Amino acid sequence: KVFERCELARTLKRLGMDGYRGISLANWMCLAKWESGYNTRATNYNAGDRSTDYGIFQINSRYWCNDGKTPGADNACHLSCSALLQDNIADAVACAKRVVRDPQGIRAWVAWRNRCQNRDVRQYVQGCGV
């Protein structure tokens, strides 16, 4: 499923993401936008370390979900990586919340640092009623 902007903003808000561990909804939107273009089916294989990034937040298999094919990987969200490819993003949101509970917070995603940190992200939620 490829979400429309405001559709996603409200979906995320209903899932309790607004202000989760101090992270505004606009930050999550900017993250999903740059990670997957709001596409829940987005996938990226990393030939370098044999891991894959899954879903709307491009959550990596080396640490967060299990796909059975990533060497010496962890599964901190305790989810099959397939759960991160559903149209329903509840499990992906649960996992993204897990990711940010760690030291780096939202900084865990390099894309956020590159495209969202110290940027004007207001435009991501304007007009969405959130």
The burial of 26, by beta-carbon neighbours within 10 Å (0-12 exposed, 13-18 middle, 19 or more buried), is given as buried
Q: Where are the beta strands (DSSP E) in the chain?
A: 43-46, 51-54, 59-60
Strand runs (DSSP E) across 24-125, as ranges?
Answer: 43-46, 51-54, 59-60
Which among 4, 7, 18, 35 is annotated as catalytic? 35
Report CA torsion sign: 111, 114, 119, 120.
Answer: negative
Q: Is 53 in the active site?
A: yes
The catalytically annotated residue of 4, 7, 49, 53 is 53
Q: Residue 35 catalytic?
A: yes
d(C-alpha 111, C-alpha 16), whole Å: 22
Which residues are identified as catalytic?
35, 53
